[PDB]
């Protein structure tokens, strides 16, 4: 589908332009709040040792990527489900309609959702998401991993999100908008167009985060 290849290309162009080594960095000029994401990962729990990775999207929907490479998504209505098999095949169900084969997986998903509500902060709680574009589809988590510095989450709409552990800063990259939103140590959020970062530059801190994102994106590519 080309999303990751496109993202790698956008990050290579911006990083090749050396955005922190300019006479006058004017990061604020690259700002475009029109490109705020529809979706990002708000919370997560890694129980990969035997259940899977659970997460919450900013619209209060929840999902799990189970150890058997399957996924299950609960919409924010609390009932509408989407199940996705190993090879991408998608079924649409309800928790009311009770296919016995998924009751254990649904039980687990509900435990994850309860766990996240009771114990975990909502990243980007102070962000109004962009309105989705017409028959707007809920994404699921394609791939994820974590290093020592960060967790890297690749959603099915092409966006990748990198949450750094040390300082709690967060990047969300969208290859469709060709944008990056940066969430600061103080939870301050800005969305930037990658083409304008090329033109105007950005501080060292974001420059390093974007260099790290390219290598993370190459890694995501190498799994393929």
């Amino acid at each position: 589908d080309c999303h990751l290849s496109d993202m790698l290309q956008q990050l290579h162009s911006v990083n090749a332009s050396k955005p922190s080594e300019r006479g006058l960095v004017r990061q604020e000029e690259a700002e475009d709040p029109a490109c705020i994401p529809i979706f990002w990962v708000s919370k997560w729990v890694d129980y990969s040792d035997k259940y899977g990775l659970g997460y919450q999207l900013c619209d209060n929907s929840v999902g799990v990527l189970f150890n058997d490479s399957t996924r299950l998504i609960l919409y924010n209505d609390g009932d509408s489900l989407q199940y996705i098999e190993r090879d991408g095949t998608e079924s649409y169900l309800t928790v009311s309609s009770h296919p016995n084969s998924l009751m254990k997986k649904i039980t687990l998903l509900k435990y994850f959702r309860n766990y996240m509500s009771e114990h975990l902060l909502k990243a980007g709680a102070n962000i109004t998401p962009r309105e989705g574009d017409e028959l707007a589809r809920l994404p699921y988590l394609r791939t994820w991993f974590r290093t020592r510095s960060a967790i890297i989450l690749h959603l099915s709409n092409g966006s990748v999100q990198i949450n750094f552990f040390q300082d709690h800063t967060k990047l969300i990259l969208c290859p469709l908008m060709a944008a990056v939103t940066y969430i600061d140590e103080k939870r301050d959020f800005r969305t930037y167009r990658l083409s304008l970062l090329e033109e105007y530059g950005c501080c060292k801190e974001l420059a390093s985060r974007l260099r790290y994102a390219r290598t993370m994106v190459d890694k995501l590519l190498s799994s393929r």
Partner: peptide
């Protein structure tokens, strides 16, 4: 492992 707590 966990995301940031309340």
């Amino acid at each position: 492992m966990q995301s940031t707590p309340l």
